C-alpha cells in the first residue's frame, strides 16, 4: 500500500522547530 | 551444582533461569530437558528480545520451525525497543523457518507466514539502505540526520 503525497511533507533539508 | 538441581523451590529456579541468561550461559540453559523453562519463557517471550531468542532456540531444536517463525515475526512487527537491523535478522530467520515443513501445520499456514516475512524483509532492507545512505550523505545537515536515525532505526515503516 503506497500513497504519494507531494503536497504536505517535512523539509528534509531544514532543522526542526 | 547437585544442591542446585536437587531443589524444588520454584521462585528459585526462575531466578536461576534469569541468572543463567544474564551470565550468558546458553551452555547450561539450552541443555535442560524440562518444559518448566519453556513455559517460563512463553510468558516473557513477547517481553524481551533476548528471552524470545532463547524460546526460538528451544522450538527449532525440536523441529518446531513454524512456531519460532511466529515468535520472530510478531517480535519484528512489535513496538518493543528493537533496532532495524535486529528486525532484519528476526524476519530473515522467520522466513527460513516458515519455508520448511513443520509437522501438524498446513502448507497454507506455512506459506502465508513465509510470505508475510518475505515482504516485511524486503521493506526492511529498503529502509536500512535508506538510513545508511542518508546518515553518510555529505549534503545532509547533521541536525536532520539525528532526526532521520530516530524515525528509521526502529519499527518498519510503510512504503
Amino acid at each position: 500500500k503506497l500513497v504519494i503525497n507531494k503536497d504536505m511533507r517535512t523539509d528534509l533539508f531544514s532543522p526542526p522547530n | 551444582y547437585n544442591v542446585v538441581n536437587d531443589s524444588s523451590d520454584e521462585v528459585f529456579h526462575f531466578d536461576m533461569y534469569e541468572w543463567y541468561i544474564e551470565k550468558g550461559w546458553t551452555d547450561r540453559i539450552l541443555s535442560i530437558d524440562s518444559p518448566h523453562v519453556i513455559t517460563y519463557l512463553q510468558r516473557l517471550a513477547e517481553t524481551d528480545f533476548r528471552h524470545a531468542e532463547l524460546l526460538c532456540r528451544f522450538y527449532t531444536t525440536r523441529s518446531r520451525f513454524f512456531e519460532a517463525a511466529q515468535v520472530q515475526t510478531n517480535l519484528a512487527k512489535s513496538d518493543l525497543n528493537i533496532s532495524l537491523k535486529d528486525r532484519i535478522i528476526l524476519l530473515s530467520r522467520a522466513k527460513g523457518n516458515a519455508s520448511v515443513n513443520t509437522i501438524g501445520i498446513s502448507r497454507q499456514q506455512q506459506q502465508q507466514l513465509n510470505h508475510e516475512a518475505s515482504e516485511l524483509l524486503e521493506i526492511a532492507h529498503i529502509q536500512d539502505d535508506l538510513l545508511e545512505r542518508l546518515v553518510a550523505d555529505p549534503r545532509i545537515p547533521e541536525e536532520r540526520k539525528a532526526e532521520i536515525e530516530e524515525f528509521l532505526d526502529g519499527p518498519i515503516r510503510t512504503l
Binding site: - | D9, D33, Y40, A45, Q110
Partner: protein
C-alpha cells in the same frame, strides 16, 4: 494432526518418502514442507548433549516446575526419578532427557506398550535416530532413481547436498565437513554399544530383555544406514586421502568379525574404485604412493583381500601406452611383484574370506530342499557369525553383488595369465600328489562369481550376447578337461545363470555341440556309473551326479526347447538312466534329485507325455 512432536514428525516424514519411492507422487507439496521444519535435524546426524552438572543439581533441588521452550510442566517425585534414570543409562543431558519423557506422557504410549515410563524414553530416543538416519537413505536413493521424472530426481539431489552434506546449492555461497561428522557419529554408536554390553552383562550375570533387543536392532540399523550414507557420499567424489588412510587404519585395528565389517566392506570397495581404479581421481602419481602404502594387520585375510582388490583395480592402468604416460618405467618387474603379491594373498585366504562373507550375507532362515548341500562342501576355516538376530537389508545386498560382479569383470579382463598359471599349478599339484587335496582357489572364485550373478539376468546376458568377448572367452576356456570340483563349480554357475528362459536357452545352445563339455560325455558318464552300480562310489562322483541332475532340472524348468528335446531324444534316453540309477543302492540325495528332475520335465506335458510317463512308471514298479 498438524502440531506433531519430533517423533511424530520423523515417523510421518518417513511415510512420505516411501510414497515417492513406491511411485506415488501425491505428497510432493507436503514433502517439501517437512524438510524446512527439520532443517536443524538433518544438519547433525546424531549428537547427544553431554551430561551437565548445572541441570543435575538444579533438577533435583526444585523438582516442582519445569519450563521447556514455551510450554510449562510440573515435576513430581515420581517423574523426576525417571529423568535421572534415563540420563544415566544413556548419558544424556537432563533437559534433553526430560523432553523425551514429556513426549511420552502427552502421546500416552505407556498404555500402548505397558512398560515403565523411564524405559519408554529409551525407545523414543532410539526411534528418533532411526527415522532421522533412515529417511536420509531414501532421499539419496530416490535422487539416484532412473525410473522417475528427471526434474524430481534432481530436486532431492540438491536438497541432500545442503540438508545432509551441508553443502549449499550452486545459486549461493569455519564449518566441519560431513565425513568427519559421520565418522565420529558411527564411533559413538560403537562406544555406546560396547558400554551397553558391559553394563547389561554385569547386571544380567527381566521385563527389559525385549527392550534391549529392540535397542540393539535399532543401533545396528542406524549403523547400516550411516554406512550406506557414507558410501553414497563417497560415490559423489567428495573424499580425500586422509579419510582413506583413517579408514585403512580403523580396518587394521579391527578385532572381531561381525556384521559391521560386512557393512564396511562396500565402503572400502568404493574407496578403491574411486582411488585405485582409473574411474576417479586419475592421478597416476598419487596411485603409486598408495600402492606402497597398502602393500600390524590383526587379521591377515583382511589385508590379503584388500591387496588383491587393490591390485585387480589398479592393474587397469598398464594396458596401453596411449591414454596415459608410462615413460621411464619398467613393466616386467611390477608385473612379477603384483603376481607374487596376489599369490600370497590367495595363500592367505582372500577368496575364502570373500566367499564366507558372501555366504553369511545371504543367510536365510529357510532354504528350498531342492538345493541342499550345494556350495557347502569346501573347507571353511573362517569363524562364523554368533548367529544373533541381525538380518540384512536389500540395498546392501544389491551393492555387494554389484561390487562383486565388477571385481569379477576386472579380474577377468586384467589378470588372465594369473588365472592360467594358478590353474596349471593346481593341475600339476593334483597330478604329482593325487592322495592330497589341492587348493580350492579356482573353485572358490567360480562360486563367488555364481553368488555375484544370481537373480540378475541383465548382467548374465553379457555372457551370451558377445561370444567373442573376454567373458565368453573365459566361459568357453573353463569348460575344457578338468577335475570333478571344477566341473561341479561350472555346472553350479550355469544353473545359477539361468534366472530366466532366454539365459536357459542360451546355455542349452552353448552346451551342446554346434573340447568343451557336451551332453554326449555327460550321458556317457551317467551310463558308466549306472552300469557300475548295477554291475564303490566316491563322494566326488555323487556330487557330480547331483550337480548334473540339478542343472538338468533347472534347464527343464526354465527352457522349453531342452524340455521338448531331452524328453523324447533317442540318443540320450535320460529317463532310463536315471531310473536304473534310482533303483540301485545309493543315498537318498540322488533319488531326490532324480525325482525333482522328473518333476521339472513333467511341469508342462500333454496326453501323450502323461501316457508315456504312466507306462514307464508301471513298467518299473511292476
Amino acid at each position: 494432526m498438524t502440531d506433531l512432536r519430533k517423533l511424530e514428525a520423523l515417523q510421518a516424514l518417513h511415510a512420505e518418502l516411501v510414497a515417492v519411492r513406491q511411485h506415488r507422487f501425491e505428497g510432493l507439496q507436503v514433502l517439501e514442507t517437512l524438510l524446512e521444519e527439520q532443517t536443524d535435524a538433518f544438519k547433525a546426524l546424531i549428537a547427544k548433549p553431554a551430561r551437565d552438572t548445572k541441570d543435575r543439581e538444579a533438577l533435583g533441588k526444585e523438582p516442582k516446575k519445569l519450563k521447556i521452550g514455551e510450554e510449562e510442566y510440573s515435576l513430581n517425585e515420581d517423574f523426576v526419578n525417571d529423568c535421572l534414570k534415563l540420563a544415566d543409562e544413556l548419558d544424556l543431558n537432563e533437559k534433553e532427557s526430560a523432553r523425551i519423557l514429556i513426549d511420552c506422557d502427552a502421546e500416552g504410549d505407556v498404555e500402548t506398550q505397558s512398560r515403565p515410563l523411564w524405559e519408554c524414553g529409551v525407545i523414543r530416543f532410539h526411534q528418533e535416530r532411526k527415522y532421522l538416519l533412515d529417511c536420509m537413505r531414501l532421499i539419496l536413493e530416490i535422487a539416484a532413481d532412473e525410473d522417475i521424472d528427471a526434474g524430481l530426481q534432481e530436486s532431492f539431489g540438491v536438497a541432500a547436498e545442503d540438508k545432509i552434506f551441508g553443502i549449499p546449492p550452486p545459486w549461493e555461497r569455519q564449518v566441519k565437513k560431513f565425513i568427519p561428522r559421520c565418522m565420529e557419529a558411527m564411533k559413538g554408536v560403537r562406544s555406546m554399544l560396547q558400554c551397553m554390553a558391559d553394563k547389561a552383562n554385569a547386571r544380567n550375570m527381566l521385563d527389559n530383555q525385549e527392550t534391549l533387543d529392540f535397542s540393539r536392532l535399532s543401533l545396528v540399523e542406524q549403523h547400516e544406514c550411516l554406512a550406506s550414507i557414507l558410501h553414497a557420499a563417497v560415490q559423489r567424489h567428495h573424499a580425500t586421502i586422509a579419510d582413506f588412510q583413517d579408514f585403512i587404519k580403523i580396518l587394521r585395528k579391527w578385532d572381531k568379525y561381525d556384521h559391521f565389517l560386512i557393512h564396511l566392506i562396500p565402503v572400502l570397495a568404493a574407496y578403491i574404485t574411486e582411488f585405485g581404479s582409473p574411474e576417479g581421481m586419475g592421478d597416476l602419481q598419487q596411485a603409486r604412493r598408495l600402492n606402497d602404502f597398502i602393500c600390524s594387520w590383526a587379521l591377515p585375510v583382511l589385508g590379503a583381500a584388500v591387496r588383491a582388490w587393490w591390485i585387480a583395480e589398479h592393474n587397469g592402468f598398464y594396458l596401453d601406452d596411449t591414454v596415459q604416460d608410462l615413460r621411464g618405467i619398467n613393466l616386467d618387474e611390477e608385473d612379477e611383484q603384483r603376481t607374487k603379491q596376489f599369490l600370497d594373498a590367495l595363500k592367505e585366504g582372500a577368496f575364502d574370506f570373500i566367499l564366507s562373507v558372501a555366504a553369511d550375507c545371504k543367510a536365510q532362515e529357510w532354504q528350498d530342499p531342492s538345493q541342499l548341500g550345494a556350495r557347502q562342501w569346501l573347507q571353511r576355516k573362517i569363524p562364523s557369525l554368533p548367529s544373533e538376530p541381525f538380518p540384512f537389508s536389500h540395498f546392501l545386498q544389491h551393492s555387494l553383488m554389484v561390487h562383486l560382479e565388477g571385481f569379477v569383470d576386472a579380474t577377468i579382463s586384467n589378470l588372465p595369465d594369473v588365472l592360467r598359471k594358478l590353474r596349471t599349478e593346481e593341475d600339476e599339484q593334483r597330478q604329482l600328489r593325487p592322495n592330497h587335496e589341492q587348493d580350492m582357489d579356482l573353485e572358490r572364485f567360480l562360486i563367488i562369481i555364481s553368488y555375484a550373478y544370481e537373480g540378475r539376468p541383465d548382467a548374465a546376458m553379457s555372457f551370451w550376447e558377445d561370444p567373442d568377448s573376454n567373458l565368453a572367452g573365459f566361459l568357453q576356456w573353463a569348460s575344457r578337461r578338468a577335475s570333478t570340483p571344477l566341473v561341479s563349480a561350472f555346472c553350479e554357475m550355469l544353473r545359477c545363470l539361468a534366472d530366466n528362459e532366454e539365459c536357459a536357452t542360451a546355455a542349452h545352445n552353448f552346451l551342446l555341440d554346434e573340447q568343451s563339455l557336451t551332453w554326449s560325455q555327460i550321458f556317457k558318464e551317467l551310463e558308466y556309473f549306472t552300469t557300475k552300480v548295477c554291475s564303490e562310489i566316491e563322494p566326488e562322483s555323487a556330487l557330480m551326479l547331483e550337480c548334473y541332475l540339478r542343472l538338468i532340472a533347472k534347464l527343464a524348468t526354465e527352457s522349453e526347447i531342452a524340455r521338448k528335446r531331452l524328453i523324447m531324444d533317442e540318443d540320450f534316453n535320460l529317463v532310463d538312466t536315471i531310473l536304473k540309477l534310482s533303483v540301485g543302492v545309493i543315498p537318498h540325495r540322488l533319488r531326490a534329485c532324480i525325482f525333482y528332475v522328473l518333476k521339472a520335465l513333467m511341469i508342462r506335458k500333454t496326453h501323450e507325455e502323461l501316457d508315456a510317463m504312466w507306462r514307464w512308471v508301471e513298467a518299473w514298479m511292476t
